[PDB]
Ligand binder design. Structure first.
Ligand SMILES: O=C(O)c1cc(C(=O)O)c2c(n1)C(=O)C(=O)c1cc(C(=O)O)[nH]c1-2
Ligand SMILES: O=C(O)c1cc(C(=O)O)c2c(n1)C(=O)C(=O)c1cc(C(=O)O)[nH]c1-2
Ligand SMILES: [Ca+2]
Ligand SMILES: [Ca+2]
Lengths: 69, 571, 571, 69
């Protein structure tokens, strides 16, 4: 794996000799929990909702307040 | 915006952390020069009342100076007519738990300015706009969530009516993204992620049209196995650059997560990428991945320096960058063409070289990392041959004065699960000085480079890593602070040390300069910390602790202790 | 011992916190003078890496400087040939709970030196002797027990082969005592209590033979009701003085406990007493109680200054002292004869005057304190018109330059029980500026006095209290640090300000001076705290918090923030 | 109570008008607990004992150790 063998432009990864092409089902399978993986997306969704509320209030009341629901 | 531009064109002001839109971090002020620098003395000082690493540098707008501290991120405004009075201050109330998810000390790289406001962030993820004259809060919004390991450390960047801000946290699996907010309201305009679908990464229809071999569409998911990209890192916590003519801003995305390379097969795009994005829409015009499938934590967030120089004879709009991986890159900032890719020091061994034709590094298997194997004598180390320091450029001699690190490492990964809010590293390291120091003990260098050839002009060795960076002033001086506590000035011609002063603590920020009432002043923060100071800051003794930095910097405590403040100098 | 005497007689050295055995806190070094002081500049600086109040000043022995910090009481040794290298350091491991029993910030007034050792204490009650060259611990002993509210803050005092050390804690009912330890082994020699039986107080057979009306035997219990003297206070945490020819050491015992005067009827001897004790046996030759039955917390521990001056044409061995109660006292240090007892400022109203014949203050009932009554406009306040500052004396013009406080108060006591290890104050206060300042807001004064008449020669007003004290150098300069952050130099003739420098944080210690390689240096600690800074240091907002100091010093935070370090200056 | 009326040399205290000459049994009686009052004495004795052991040991060992008992 010298990074010069590309199967597609911009895609030149190769498994190192002795290692699997795919780790799923191997001894290196990370076995990530699907729910755990989506926590960041759920966090941003809630965060964006709180900000939108803050921006909306200040726009109509003319006064900006952080704590609001 | 127009206000910021006015300050930028005002002689003696310092409204931008990197010195200007091009981020050359230099100054035309020449009152202090090679002939009188020996007479420079301390003018006054100011303590922040906080310890830990004090990165960045203050801002000067008109006759007002704005100073910032490490966590809890306090802001102090002072009128230069009387440095003894604090006009206004903002002291955030944050949960102490925030510090637990910060990888590399509770640092803050600085404030920003725009539309008569001071733009400041807090480690806990809040971004605020404060009236520059009164400190009144105009707006405050959430940008990052510490609960999932996301925090804020980089300085905000203002261009036109937009504020750019990126969260930190790749060591906790945080998926990177540059967030854009309205300067006047704090409303989210858009955000461009480092991994994922082309829509989430925000790529223009002509993305990399000039260099198709860099890769184009669908790679944000294709170069990963399954949904590994969701926690694939790529955070951008470094510095930005902006070209008003092209309306493109530039920055680099960070390292992929976890550090264990075996757990994430694939090129891992678009982590470790130099970007050229439209400021208005955030759509990427071009993107070059420097380190496909990172195996060393070479977070590619380093400073982007824009310059205009003749290449082979013709004037070309350039972008230069010295990555953690030890390679100095110079590209056409208009289309992304790769022009220069040279090692900053011959010790770099992770790559044989960077092929300008294929555009990728020719990897040396002997220094790769992988499960069930202990890699040894790998250069650079994860701290890189260049980290968060802001370097300077002299437009006269066309030279970049870089603050480099000369540290290599031993590395071995191990399996671990991902849990939001917890660290997701998966590697044990040992770090030590590189092999080229005069006595094989030196870990820092101030090295001058020609950006069109990538060749060095001169080198000055330092006992410890040159973490903060350098400042260049037209008087022919290169200023920089050391981890051991000195502010120094060198002759830009040969690197000869002309002056120095022993500050209270080591400096990890880059010096700045301004003029007030006709006098030129040099300002530097002090207070050691950051990754190099973790052992000292948290009283660690295990050499492998601090992600392997404790052992390498064990002698630092014999030269300096913690601190937090600003020292200003002048004739 | 002989080693200390050697250092005392070495030009340019600074082996004693108060400047010498007589504690005149001055220096014959005249390199820096009125004609060139304007050219003094910062030489170097050093951060302790600790916040909170930084009292005291460093010691200089040969080419070595020893610096101390606030709690946890760290010691740093530096060779003046290279301030960038810490030769050795001692960082104690102390339980954080120790801070909870300290009344007035976690301060440390300094180190001592004797027999080639650095004598240091820790807030938690330990006293140690370390080799001055290597830092190796020769002996460590227990002196105070925080479990009962006793801690250590004052600087140790070395005379001959004895180390004098007194515990703090009168606000917690701690019975005061001066403890004497063998310089070489740390063995307890004797202990002299402030209250109790004559045997425990250690009174000589001829105690006060020259002034029987001061009181002699049996008063340590007779001037109290019942066993109240057991938790009677009288701790000595200030400064000492020693006369080698008479072999007498001098110091003042503190306030009685509790602050509620109604809970302790009687003169409460021997609290607030000026003592003249034999160094070898600890036996008191004489003792003068300045404030019988304290009603205002005028802890009588202030500096004792020994001078030899003509009184009405007659050369006399004198002892001068400015108490918290606002009275300047001058006595014959041989027999305790009272010579001068004058108000340092006309605002003093707790006493009409001090009767020289009866030897006691003529009390003004209108400004007394007592249960079920709120006293108002009482001057001085509990902070006193003089606190822990170390002043200086010019032997040529025979003038004392005093750092004074101009603060008064409202006071009402209340009943409370005594529980070992818990606070035992019993009073609610409100403090504010005295009535004589130019705008009625000024709380500090530098005032020059003739110690034989008690008359002032000149006055310089300061916004905040002059807490640290002053240093006098033969060049005709009065040096001092301010709470707001400046180190200043005044013309000793008229108090005219000739030079100043803005340090990182306010200073609460007194400046010191030394010589190295033919150059005179001025050193000053910085890092605001102590009683005046409690509001700032602990983020307090209630005006009555901090024993009433928070409200009075509310504006301090608009001038300075916390810090911790040393700054050195020279030509 | 002006401080000038002394029943004995060095003893000039007087109760203020309206206050008792003795507080025991009055509304200002502190009612101190004898057990609490003796705490300091008990602490000093134990402390002196510990120091004595440290000194003795050192004088007969050439080496000083604090944690000794
Ligand atoms: O992946 C990330 O988000 C992240 C964040 C930070 C940061 O924001 O301090 C650092 C790093 N990585 C990192 O790789 C690193 O070398 C580093 C050094 C420092 C510093 O301030 O000294 N921060 C960071
Ligand atoms: O009664 C005592 O034992 C005691 C101790 C201390 C101390 O050691 O800090 C202070 C006081 N009292 C006190 O009365 C006071 O005014 C004071 C000021 C300070 C200071 O360092 O600023 N300490 C103390
Ligand atoms: Ca990283
Ligand atoms: Ca007291």
């Amino acid at each position: 794996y010298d990074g010069q063998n590309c199967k597609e432009p911009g895609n030149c990864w190769e498994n190192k000799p002795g290692y699997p092409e795919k780790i799923a089902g191997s001894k290196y399978d990370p076995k990530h929990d699907p729910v755990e993986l989506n926590k960041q997306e759920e966090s941003i969704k809630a965060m964006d909702a709180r900000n939108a509320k803050r921006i909306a209030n200040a726009k109509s009341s003319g006064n900006f307040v952080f704590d609001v629901k | 915006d127009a206000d910021l531009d006015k300050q930028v064109n005002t002689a003696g002001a310092w409204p931008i952390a990197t010195g200007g839109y091009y981020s050359q971090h230099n100054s035309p002020l020449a009152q202090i020069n090679k002939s009188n620098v020996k007479n420079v003395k301390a003018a006054w000082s100011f303590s922040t009342g906080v310890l830990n690493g004090h990165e960045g540098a203050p801002l000067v707008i008109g006759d007002m100076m704005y100073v910032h501290s490490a966590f809890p991120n306090n802001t102090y405004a002072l009128n230069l007519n009387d440095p003894g009075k604090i006009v206004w201050q903002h002291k955030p109330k944050q949960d102490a738990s925030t510090k637990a998810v910060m990888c590399c000390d509770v640092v803050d790289r600085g404030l920003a300015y725009g539309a008569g406001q001071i733009v400041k962030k807090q480690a806990n993820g809040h971004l605020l706009a404060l009236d520059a004259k009164t400190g009144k809060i105009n707006w405050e919004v959430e940008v990052c969530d510490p609960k999932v390991g996301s925090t804020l450390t980089q300085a905000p960047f203002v261009a036109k009516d937009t504020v750019l801000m990126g969260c930190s946290g790749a060591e906790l699996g945080v998926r990177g993204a540059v967030n854009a907010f309205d300067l006047k309201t704090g409303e989210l305009k858009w955000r461009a992620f480092a991994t994922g679908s082309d829509d989430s990464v925000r790529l223009a229809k002509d993305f990399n049209s000039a260099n198709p071999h860099y890769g184009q569409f669908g790679l944000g998911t294709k170069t990963w196995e399954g949904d590994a990209w969701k926690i694939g890192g790529g955070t951008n916590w470094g510095w930005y650059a902006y070209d008003p003519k092209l309306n493109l801003f530039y920055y680099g995305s960070g390292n992929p997560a976890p550090w264990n390379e075996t757990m994430r097969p694939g090129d891992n795009k678009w982590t470790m990428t130099i970007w050229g994005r439209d400021l208005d829409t955030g759509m990427a015009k071009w993107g070059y991945q420097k380190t496909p499938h990172d195996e060393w934590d070479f977070a590619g967030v380093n400073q982007m320096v824009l310059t205009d120089q003749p290449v082979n004879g013709k004037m070309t709009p350039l972008l230069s960058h010295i990555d953690r991986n030890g390679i100095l890159y110079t590209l056409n900032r208009e289309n992304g063409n790769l022009i220069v890719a040279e090692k900053v020091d011959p010790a770099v061994n992770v790559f044989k070289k960077v092929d300008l034709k294929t555009g990728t590094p020719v990897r040396d298997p002997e220094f790769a990392t992988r499960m069930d194997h202990k890699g040894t004598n790998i250069c650079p180390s994860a701290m890189g041959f260049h980290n968060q320091g802001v370097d300077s450029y002299d437009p006269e001699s066309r030279t970049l004065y870089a603050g480099l690190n000369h540290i290599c490492m031993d590395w071995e990964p191990f399996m671990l699960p991902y849990r939001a809010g917890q660290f997701f590293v998966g590697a044990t390291l040992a770090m030590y000085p590189g092999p080229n120091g005069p006595t094989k003990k030196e870990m820092g260098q101030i090295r001058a480079f020609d950006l069109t050839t990538g060749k060095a002009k001169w080198t000055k060795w330092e006992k410890f890593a040159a973490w903060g960076g350098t400042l260049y002033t037209k008087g022919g001086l290169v200023w920089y602070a050391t981890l051991d506590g000195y502010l120094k000035a060198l002759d830009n011609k040969d690197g000869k040390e002309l002056w120095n002063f022993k500050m209270p603590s080591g400096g990890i920020g880059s010096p700045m300069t301004y003029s007030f009432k006709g006098k030129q002043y040099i300002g530097s923060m002090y207070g050691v910390g950051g990754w190099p100071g973790v052992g000292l800051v948290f009283d660690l003794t295990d050499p492998s602790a601090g992600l392997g930095a404790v052992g390498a910097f064990r002698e630092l405590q014999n030269h300096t202790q913690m601190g937090g403040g600003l020292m200003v100098f002048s004739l």
